[PDB]
Amino acid sequence: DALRTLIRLGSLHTPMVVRTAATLRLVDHILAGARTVKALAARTDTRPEALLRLIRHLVAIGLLEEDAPGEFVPTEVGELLADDHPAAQRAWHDLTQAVARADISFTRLPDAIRTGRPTYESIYGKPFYEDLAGRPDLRASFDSLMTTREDTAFAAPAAAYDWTNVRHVLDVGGGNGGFAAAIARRAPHVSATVLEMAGTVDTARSYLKDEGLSDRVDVVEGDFFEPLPRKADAIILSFVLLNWPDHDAVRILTRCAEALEPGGRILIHERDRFFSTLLDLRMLVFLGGALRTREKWDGLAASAGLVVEEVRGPLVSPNVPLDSCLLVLAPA
Amino acid sequence: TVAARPQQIDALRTLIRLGSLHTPMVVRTAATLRLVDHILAGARTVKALAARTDTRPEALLRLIRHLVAIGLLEEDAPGEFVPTEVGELLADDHPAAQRAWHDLTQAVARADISFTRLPDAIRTGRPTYESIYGKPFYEDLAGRPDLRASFDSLMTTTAFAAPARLDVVDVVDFFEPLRKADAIILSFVLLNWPDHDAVRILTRCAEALEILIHERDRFFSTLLDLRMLVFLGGALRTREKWDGLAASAGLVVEVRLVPLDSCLLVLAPA
Ligand SMILES: CC[C@@]1(O)C[C@H](O)c2c(cc3c(c2O)C(=O)c2c(O)cccc2C3=O)[C@H]1C(=O)OC
Ligand SMILES: Nc1ncnc2c1ncn2[C@@H]1O[C@H](CSCC[C@H](N)C(=O)O)[C@@H](O)[C@H]1O
Numbered sequence: 001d002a003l004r005t006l007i008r009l010g011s012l013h014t015p016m017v018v019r020t021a022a023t024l025r026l027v028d029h030i031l032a033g034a035r036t037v038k039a040l041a042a043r044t045d046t047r048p049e050a051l052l053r054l055i056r057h058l059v060a061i062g063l064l065e066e067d068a069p070g071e072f073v074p075t076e077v078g079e080l081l082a083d084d085h086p087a088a089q090r091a092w093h094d095l096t097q098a099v100a101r102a103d104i105s106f107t108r109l110p111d112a113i114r115t116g117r118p119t120y121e122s123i124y125g126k127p128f129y130e131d132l133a134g135r136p137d138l139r140a141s142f143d144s145l146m147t148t149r150e151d152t153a154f155a156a157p158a159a160a161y162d163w164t165n166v167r168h169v170l171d172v173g174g175g176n177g178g179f180a181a182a183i184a185r186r187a188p189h190v191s192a193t194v195l196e197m198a199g200t201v202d203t204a205r206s207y208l209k210d211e212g213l214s215d216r217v218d219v220v221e222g223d224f225f226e227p228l229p230r231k232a233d234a235i236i237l238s239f240v241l242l243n244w245p246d247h248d249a250v251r252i253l254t255r256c257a258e259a260l261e262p263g264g265r266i267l268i269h270e271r272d273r274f275f276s277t278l279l280d281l282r283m284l285v286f287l288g289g290a291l292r293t294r295e296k297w298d299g300l301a302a303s304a305g306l307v308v309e310e311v312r313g314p315l316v317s318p319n320v321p322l323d324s325c326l327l328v329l330a331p332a
Numbered sequence: 333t334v335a336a337r338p339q340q341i342d343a344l345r346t347l348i349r350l351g352s353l354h355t356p357m358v359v360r361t362a363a364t365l366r367l368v369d370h371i372l373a374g375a376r377t378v379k380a381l382a383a384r385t386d387t388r389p390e391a392l393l394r395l396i397r398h399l400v401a402i403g404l405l406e407e408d409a410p411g412e413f414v415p416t417e418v419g420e421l422l423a424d425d426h427p428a429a430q431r432a433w434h435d436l437t438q439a440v441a442r443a444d445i446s447f448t449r450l451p452d453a454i455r456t457g458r459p460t461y462e463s464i465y466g467k468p469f470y471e472d473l474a475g476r477p478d479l480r481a482s483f484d485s486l487m488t489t490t491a492f493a494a495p496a497r498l499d500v501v502d503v504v505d506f507f508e509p510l511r512k513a514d515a516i517i518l519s520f521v522l523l524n525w526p527d528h529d530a531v532r533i534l535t536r537c538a539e540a541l542e543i544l545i546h547e548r549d550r551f552f553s554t555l556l557d558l559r560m561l562v563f564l565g566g567a568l569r570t571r572e573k574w575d576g577l578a579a580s581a582g583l584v585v586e587v588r589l590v591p592l593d594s595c596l597l598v599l600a601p602a
């Protein structure tokens with residue numbers, strides 16, 4: 001059982017069988033009628049001999065089942081690869097989309113452990129966010145992926161804070177505007193600014209406009225290593241700082257400290273050890289970032305001239321197998 | 333607001349485990365760095381292990397976290413990590429040679445990178461190995477003597493072999509005219525080849541006879557077969573496919589065994 005258990009752990013073919021299936025929209029095509037190999041091969045544009053060899057392992061791991069002879073149907077776990085499923089797992093495993101494409105960086109993990117440095121650029125030619133800035137399909141795909149992680153609703157992180165005395169929110173690296181939008185639905189008196197990159201600002205405005213939230217949340221295109229576009233009572237950093245090594249993280253925290261109004265707060269929204277280490281090693285090979293322990297957080301806070309006032313407890317979100325925290329940061 | 337449904341979370345966790353590239357690459361990185369050997373040699377602190385492996389200590393520790401999470405390393409004493417029961421199989425002296433199997437510097441774990449382009453293999457039926465490394469699998473080994481050495485040594489667990497009433501006394505391209513013999517042995521050979529190369533090999537064997545093929549949970553049958561797709565364009569084959577191949581070579585199957593089970597197909601001239 002040890003030799004068997006280690007070979008399953010060490011197996012590279014099972015993950016890429018799952019990822020090949022997601023990229024081919026296999027489960028979509030089955031659910032739309034193509035239950036046999038010959039029909040599925042034509043829908044996916046694959047060699048019929050080759051599909052069957054892929055399907056065999058899909059059956060052997062319990063994502064596919066055989067109902068009638070020759071006819072394949074997804075199981076309960078395999079249904080999560082339907083494109084419309086609310087956890088978006090198909091797109092998370094779609095090698096044409098930005099995250100599963102970034103996971104190829106894991107094939108150079110030894111380099112990342114030897115150096116502490118990301119392996120993405122050594123595969124694709126440019127660092128992560130610079131690659132997206134020249135690949136609008138990947139920029140859009142990454143933004144859509146980050147939004148679905150809270151059912152695009154971000155209800156749990158926005159409930160974890162009291163917005164009574166907050167006039168303006170600046171969502172720094174706020175993505176497509178989901179967190180800003182969630183605060184505005186909860187606190188009708190607050191207005192908000194989303195600071196994001198080229199490409200993402202457009203999809204953020206569309207999303208915010210399509211929420212009827214255009215009158216209350218606006219979107220600025222800029223670089224958060226530079227002076228922030230305005231001041232605010234609540235500055236949001238939501239899955240931003242784990243993208244960055246300690247020195248860049250402090251730089252970002254400092255720009256936010258400079259932009260705080262008197263009495264205002266910086267809010268860090270960030271993080272099953274299997275899933276904790278997945279995100280942490282992703283940050284290594286993608287970007288050179290990391291997850292940080294509470295003690296490391298005090299250290300980074302102090303380098304930016306801030307204190308961790310409190311850490312508001314597990315926020316459970318749908319579609320994410322992993323909880324998160326909200327860190328409230330006070331100027332020292 | 334949020335609705336958390338445990339049956340769907342359990343299902344989501346299952347699919348993400350199945351789909352994750354980090355667990356296999358963490359095991360392969362550990363095997364490539366000889367982590368378990370170094371631990372067994374008395375390096376239990378992260379600082380020593382990083383020195384022996386020439387990795388940054390912060391990064392090594394994050395690798396260890398996942399090795400702990402998946403059960404290959406137990407923490408035991410604060411800051412001193414030890415192999416578990418499963419972890420001990422990464423020891424270099426272990427007879428299953430799993431460490432050599434997962435070492436990215438050896439031939440097979442290096443070839444396993446071909447799995448990163450599985451869609452190309454499924455779309456086309458052609459191997460992806462030469463698209464990543466530049467040479468088809470065996471051309472690559474012919475120009476890389478340490479990889480030809482690693483593979484030959486992996487397979488025990490041509491001139492580049494010879495440890496020392498036929499099997500293709502010791503004697504040195506079975507695509508060339510082969511001595512003769514009363515039984516020729518093709519053991520885990522023909523799965524390495526497309527159907528036409530397999531027929532060629534079987535043909536030469538037929539021309540020297542006065543033929544037994546030794547080849548084949550399903551997770552391990554599909555691993556070997558999908559490896560043969562992305563590495564070489566070979567495949568595991570069914571009784572029906574073996575008959576069509578025997579016929580193309582002038583032969584007839586006259587199909588006989590206990591991680592993976594094997595079979596014996598004795599072939600006679602038609
Ligand atoms: C561990 C059990 C076993 O060794 C059983 C069997 O012996 C076998 C395996 C692997 C390979 C070959 C085998 O024959 C093989 O022939 C081959 C080849 O010709 C050319 C390239 C790679 C391989 C290759 O990776 C192993 C397996 O099936 O699962 C890991
Ligand atoms: N230099 C920079 N200036 C502004 N935004 C940046 C930036 N570098 C990265 N970002 C943005 O930081 C974001 C991190 S992903 C986090 C998105 C969103 N806040 C959420 O929680 O879902 C990306 O969308 C990226 O565009």
Ligand SMILES: Nc1ncnc2c1ncn2[C@@H]1O[C@H](CSCC[C@H](N)C(=O)O)[C@@H](O)[C@H]1O
Pocket residue numbers: 470484487490499500505506507519520521524
């Ligand atoms: N054109 C060729 N002629 C002869 N041998 C070849 C070949 N191409 C590959 N091989 C060898 O065939 C082997 C398949 S694996 C070993 C097969 C079996 N154990 C045996 O004893 O023969 C590999 O070691 C590979 O080096």
